[PDB]
Amino acid sequence: KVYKKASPNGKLTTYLAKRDYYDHKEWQDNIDGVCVVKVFGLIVVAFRYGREMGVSFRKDFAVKQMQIYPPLEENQRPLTKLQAKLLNKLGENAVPFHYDLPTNTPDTVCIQPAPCGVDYQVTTYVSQNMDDKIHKRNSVSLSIRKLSYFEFGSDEQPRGEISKMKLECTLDKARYYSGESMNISVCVKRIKIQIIQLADICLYETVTYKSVVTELETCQVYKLRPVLEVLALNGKVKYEDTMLAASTEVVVSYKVRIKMTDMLLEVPFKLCPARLKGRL
């Protein structure tokens, strides 16, 4: 793909590699696009909690901030190939920009309804100062999605033992990627298997939402799909790509809860985003 938005004024279009940029801890999908006309750029990070008689809390702040044009030789950086190819599809009045992906800011997250979440945007604008007013005509804004792809780190095999009758319950796979299924060897009337998402908002009001993803009621072994076609989301609900919002490293986490009629057992496991084939 190519990710393009033009301005309401028309006088500048911005192009982006893709829309979802993943932090890998040791390196990250930085932002290497091209601008076409001074001209400035930044990344807004939005924190919203509630909508406009409870509690509205909106907080925006600019994290990277940049003169794009003319390219100051300090911010000058290696041109990506996509940048290299785009700069040939268009004129010499096309300028390549780059932003370091902003790690040590929180992953995109969007709790549906207290509505709540974190958002990201690339914004490039004309001005005669970096802290001058950012109007709507000379601005462009493209929503991006910033996510954390943290794989390395084992301590594998979820399992919880307990004994009033003894109950050892192991789980297939220690981390699971969005889309994957869950198996649960309950090697001990009823059995209740529950995947709960915890989301702890700390956006002013400090709230803890516990939320039931999937469940069955019926040595034995049972299966569950910790997916969304079956809540903290990695995205806005209008995007059919939006999935469940993946264990933080808003704080999201997951846990299995086995109740047998009463013996009781709650077992953690990490949830990573949906495995890709476009790493670096």
Select 96 or 235, whichever has its Cβ closest to Cl ion: 235
For the CB of residue 75, give the shortest distance to Cl ion in the complex, in Å. 28
**Token code pair at residue 152:** 């390395």
How far, CA to CA in Å, does 105 sit from each of 23, 101, 149, 171, 197? 11, 10, 14, 32, 22
For the CB of residue 145, give the shortest distance to Cl ion in the complex, in Å. 5
In 3D, which of 125, 181, 150, 189 has the Cα closest to residue 26?
Answer: 150
**Token code pair at residue 6:** 């033009």
Neighbours of 29 (CB within 10 A): 20
For the CB of residue 234, give the shortest distance to Cl ion in the complex, in Å. 7
For the CB of residue 46, give the shortest distance to Cl ion in the complex, in Å. 12
**Residue number with the shortest CB distance to Cl ion?**
235
For the CB of residue 277, give the shortest distance to Cl ion in the complex, in Å. 21
How far, CA to CA in Å, does 112 sit from each of 82, 195, 254? 35, 18, 17
For the CB of residue 32, give the shortest distance to Cl ion in the complex, in Å. 21
Contact criterion met (CB below 8 Å) for 92 and 70: no
Select 47 or 239, whichever has its Cβ closest to Cl ion: 239
Contact criterion met (CB below 8 Å) for 118 and 61: no
Select 149 or 239, whichever has its Cβ closest to Cl ion: 239
What is the Cα–Cα distance from 64 to 174, expressed in whole angstroms? 36
Which residues are near Cl ion by CB under 5 A? 235-236, 239
Query: Which residue stretches of the chain are H helix?
Result: 81-89
